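Ticket reopened. Same input as before:
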Amino acid sequence: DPKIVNIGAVLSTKKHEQIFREAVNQANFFHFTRKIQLNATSVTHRPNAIQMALSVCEDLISSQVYAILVSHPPAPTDHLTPTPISYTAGFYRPVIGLTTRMSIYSDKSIHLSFLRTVPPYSHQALVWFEMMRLFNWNHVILIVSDDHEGRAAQKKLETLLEEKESKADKVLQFEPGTKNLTALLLEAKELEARVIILSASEDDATAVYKSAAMLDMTGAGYVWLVGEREISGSALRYAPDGIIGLQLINGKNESAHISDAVAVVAQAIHELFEMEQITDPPRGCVGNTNIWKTGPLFKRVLMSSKYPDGVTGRIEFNEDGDRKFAQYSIMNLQNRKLVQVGIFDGSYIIQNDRKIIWPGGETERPQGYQMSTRLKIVTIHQEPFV
Amino acid sequence: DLLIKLAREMDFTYEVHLVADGKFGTQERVNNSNAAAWNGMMGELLSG
Amino acid sequence: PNMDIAVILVGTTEEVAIKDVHEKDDFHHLPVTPRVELVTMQESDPKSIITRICDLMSDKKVQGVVFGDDTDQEAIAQILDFISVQTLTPILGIHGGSSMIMADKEEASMFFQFGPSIEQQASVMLNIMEEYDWYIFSIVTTYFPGYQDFENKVRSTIENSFVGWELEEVIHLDMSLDDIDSKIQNQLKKLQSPVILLYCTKEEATYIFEVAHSVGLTGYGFTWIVPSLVAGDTDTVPDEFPTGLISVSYDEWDYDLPARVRDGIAIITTAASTMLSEHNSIPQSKSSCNNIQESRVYEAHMLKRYLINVTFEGRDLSFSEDGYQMHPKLVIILLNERKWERVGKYKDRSLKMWPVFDLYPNSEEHKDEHLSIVTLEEAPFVIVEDVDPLSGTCMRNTVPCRKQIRPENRTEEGGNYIKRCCKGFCIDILKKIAKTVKFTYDLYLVTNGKHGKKINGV
Amino acid sequence: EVIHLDMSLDDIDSKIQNQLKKLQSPVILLYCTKEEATYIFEVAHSVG
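Engineering reply: fixed in the latest deploy. New output:
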C-alpha cells in the first residue's frame, strides 16, 4: 500500500475546498503514484485567532501535513490578518500564498518558510518601470504612505534604478489617517518634476484626489500613475478621467491557483520522495518539542518549480519565493468608466486599439516630461560680493 | 553684475535669493536621539 | 492594589531554587502591590503556550507576562507577539527563544526583548576595531535580511567621524548554489585587509569558512569578526572555525536569573505605577481570551511613552523606540582547546580589556616580556596634557601616560591613578623606533623624587 | 621579503598558502624543482 501523505490548506468557502479535494484526486491520477498517496485536508477561516490556531493544531497539524496553503479571510473589513497563521508552520519550519498582495510577506524575517504564487504590489512597481520604457521618463515622484508597504516599494524602486539610468527626485511620506495634506501638494508642485506616482490605499488616495483637486493640479503636464487601490471603491468618482490604472487578471475566483498549487505541491512530493531521508512531521501540537529538519529543503524544492505550459501561464519563482511573469492590465478611466487600453503578459506591454487619454485634455504625449525657463539663483551674504 | 552678464548672454529668467545661516555641511556629530541621519547640506543644491 | 505578575519558566531546570525570591514584602514602597506567580512548562509547543496563557489569564487577572526559556528558536518569540495581538501585554524577554532580535515589528505590539540590535553590535565592533587601530577593513555580507542598514550604518558612520577609515569593497556571496563555477573564490581572493567582518548565519558561515580555509583568509595578518547570531551557542564548536575569532555575544553568566526576574517586575511595576502617580487615572485589568471587542477600547498607548525612559537603582536601565534595551550587557569572547573564552567587557560606552593582554598578537613565541618607559614633563621633550572629559581617550599619536598619586589626607595616604595624554619629541622618536623594531612598552611620570640627586650618602 | 617553503608534507595546516598570499609584486621568482613546482603552481592557481 502507498504511503498516506497529507497536504494542509486554508481556504474560505466550501466550493474552494471541493476544488481542492478534486485537484488532489486529479493529482493522484495524472501523476505516477507507486508508493505515495496524496490526501486532501483543508479547513476554513475562523473569526477567532485562538480557535483558528487550535483548529490548525487539532485539524491540520494533527493529520501530519507537509505543505499548507492559504488564501484570504472572507471579510469586507481588515482587522485580523492571517499573518500569525503563517507563524504556526514557522514552529515546524511551508506556507504558500494565493491572494496575498501586501509586500510585508516579501521579507524573510517573520516569513522564513513562506512562499507565494501571486505578484504583490511591489511587482506592480516593476510594471511602472516598464512605463519608463514607453515614453522614456526620467524624473519621477513617488508619493507613498508611512508604513511597511511604502518602504518596501521604495527599496524596490531604488533597487530597480541601480544602474546609470534615471534616478529619483523626492519621495513624500504621510501618516495613513491625515486629511490635511496640502503641504505635500505645495512642496510637490514647487518641485520641477511633475510625474506623480501615487501608491496608497483608498482613504489616503481620496484625500490626495480632494486636496490635489482643490488646488488645480490635474491639468496639462501632470501625470498620475497609480496601481489598483486608487480606482476601486470610493476612490473612483474622485479620480480624474484619464488616470493610468492597473487591473490584475482573474482577481476573484482563482481556481487555476488551487489546481496549479496542488500540481506544484504534488510535483514537489513525487520528486521530493525520490532522494532519501525525508523525515515526517510530528503528530499534533501536544508533546512535540523538536522542529522539522526538512524545512529549507522543502522550500528549495517548492522554489525550484517550472511550469511553462501551466494554466496561469509560466509558473516560476525568484530568489525571494514570489511570482514571476505577472499578468496585469493597464486600464484608463474614460467617461466615468474603466476602458481597457493595455495588457501586461509578463515580458512586454501590449496595447490594444484604444488611444490613451490624458486627464489634462491632451491626446499626444510630448517628448520632454517638463521644461521651462525659470532658473532660481541663490548666494551668500557678503559685503564686497553681494 | 556677473549674474546680469550671464543673464544677458543667455535667454533665461533669474531670481536671486538670500540664504540665512547653515553653511557648514551639517556635521551630524552630536548624539541626538540615536537615530539615522541624512545628507541635507554638504553640496547645498537640492533642498527645493 | 495587588497586581498579578506571572513568570513562565520553560525548561528542565528545577524551579524550587528559582521561585524562592526574598525581594518582596519589604520592597513594596509603591502604592501598588505586585505578587509573583511563577509557572512551569516542560513541553515547548504553541498549543501549550496559548493554553497556559488563556487559562492562566481567565483564572488569574495578570498584568505583566514574563516569558523565559533556554532554547534557540526565535519563531516561538514571534508566537509571543501573537499573544500581544490578543492581549497587547508588555512581554519582556530575558533568556531563550525570546532573546533574539527581529527588525521591523508591529507598531501596536508591546514586545520588548533584551537582545542587542545591529546598531549596537556594529558600534561595539567599530569600537574594538578603533582601539586596536584597524582602519582598513573588508566587510563580507550575504543575503540575510538586515544588511542594507548594516552597510549604510558603517558607511554613514565612517563618512562623518574624525577617524580616517578606509573601505575597500563590501562584496556579496550567494549560498543557493555551491561554489563550483569559480565565483565565490574570485570574490574572496581580493581581500587584503587586516580585519574582515562577516554578516550571515551558521550553516552559511560553515561554508564561507570552509571555502575560506582553501582560499587563504584564515591565517596570519587576517582576522575575521562575527556578531552574535553567527556563532550561536558556545558549546557547539565545529572544526572549520580557525583560531582567533573575536565574537560579541550576551553575557548570560554573572547576571543571575532571579535578578532578571526582579528587574522585569521592577520595570513592569514601575511603568504601571508612573501613570497612576502622574495621570492619577488607570483603567481596569485584562479581560478573558476571546473577549477582545469589549476591552479593545480600554487599552491606551500612553504607557508606551513610559516604556522608553525607565530608571532604576540610578543606572540608565531604559529601552528605545524599537523595543529593545538601550544598554545591553554585552561580552566579547575569543576562540582559541577551541573554547570561547572572555577577553573584555563593554559597558556603557567604554570597553574594558583586563582578563586578557592588551597586545593582540601573542608573545608565546615572537618577543617576550615587555618594556616600561618613565619620563618627566619637560619643556621641549615631553609635553603632558590632561585628557579631555568629553571623550576620555587620547587621540592620534598622543600616548596615554598614567600617573600614580597618593592623596595626602592629613595623616593618611591613598592610591589614585590619574591618566593623561603625553606627546612631544620623545613620543615621536620612541614611536618611530617602536614601530620599526615592533615592541610593546609603557609610559608614566614621576610624582616624588624628581631628578636623581645625592642624599646624605646615597 | 624572500620567503621559504618546505616540501615534506601536504599543505593541511594552511601555512604555505599563508606564505604565498602575501606576494604583491608584478614579478615573482621561483627556485625549486619540478614536482615541487607543480604543487606551488597548483596552490598558486587557487590563491590567485
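The longest strand of chain A covers residues 3-11. Residues 255-272 of chain A form the longest helix (18 residues). Please confirm and we'll close it.
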